[PDB]
Symmetry: C3
Subunit: 157 residues, 3 copies
């Protein structure tokens, strides 16, 4: 029958985000000769842990229709394109490129953890922050301020 085939071909589609609604957490997607209604996108976690990282206009995605009584569809980022190419060719590295030019990266080849291209950086811990490593370098252009009752240097200078 002719629409079982229509339902099957529309079950999984690919397309481009054309509009986002950050409050609703929904987007509209151009796929084939139409633009979808407002669809939710899948995120990494939406349970006891919750992630948020909104897809952007121009981002290529899959659209998965559930069909049935419900008949909703969901958006799943993301697919590399000419406009949005892979930011790396590394065999094993996790590489994250933010639109401000910042990079978060771990490269298992050199075992190098890299954060760069940012302005601010804050860690607020209630108990302990420790660091255990042969060499530590701080290159402060302005000054390092040590707001504490106490600093123990263990040996020499």
């Amino acid at each position: 029958i002719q629409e079982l085939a229509r339902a099957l071909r529309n079950m999984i589609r690919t397309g481009i985000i054309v509009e986002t609604d950050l409050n609703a957490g929904r987007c509209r997607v151009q796929t084939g000769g139409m633009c979808t209604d407002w669809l939710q996108w899948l995120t990494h976690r939406a349970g006891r842990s919750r992630t948020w990282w909104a897809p952007s206009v121009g981002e290529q995605v899959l659209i998965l229709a559930v069909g049935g009584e419900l008949d909703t569809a969901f958006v799943l980022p993301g697919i590399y394109s000419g406009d949005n190419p892979s930011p790396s060719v590394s065999a094993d590295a996790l590489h994250i490129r933010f639109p401000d030019g910042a990079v978060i990266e771990y490269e298992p080849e050199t075992s190098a953890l890299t954060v760069s291209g940012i302005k601010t950086a804050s860690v607020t811990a209630s108990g302990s922050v420790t660091a255990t490593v042969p060499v530590v370098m701080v290159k402060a252009s302005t000054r390092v301020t040590l707001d504490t009752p106490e600093v123990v240097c263990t040996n020499r200078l």
Copy 2:
């Protein structure tokens, strides 16, 4: 035929996690008028790099059936709900909210990297940990301990 249509509608479904098996890495999901058998969930990576971040009871997910000789199905988190709403409305930020209230976040708008709401924090490196930035502030309520043969302050006090 009437079950091609049944297979098609059951190919992609949405539902809610009702039980987890952390040892097996499987979950059961309520979808429509039934609860699935124990299904594996998809994770970010399961190769040379491996991720683990178990979905939780109450989390809304997609279920994707492979059909065929195999006929298995897999669970894919996650979809925002009333119980589990988006933890942010930020246009570009990666925002992670843990159930202990901790937040990991980078906001490209302010280029601010944020870790907060945690107790402990440990970095164990075999070689070098360096930090290159104009201003550095440490606000230790108790004390900072510098267990090293040597600390070079490069200029003044």
Copy 3:
């Protein structure tokens, strides 16, 4: 009809990565009695933010065919296997295991943020890096170097 059923069963498949092309960002996958052509894989983000974390040979994945005029298919990691088992059983923790043995982990149970098993670690910020916590420990086997015009210890020693 006999190939609506063939299209339906081939719509969603599972298989194993047998070859990768890091430049093209494509992989070939063994599924059933065949190996696919070069298929793109889905990544976390491919928009204003862009992620890269290539799947590896031996990694079990889903393959999603879009059918239709396009008829392409996309690869979605990842599924735990005997070769690539879950690196954790933790109820709430995000756990990342790199092939160099490094671990990135937050465990909400103990509220402990863990980075370990790495060699290098660099943060390059243009403005501020601050840290706000009762206890701070640095255990430098070799030396800590403070390349700054100024360090203010706020009280005592």
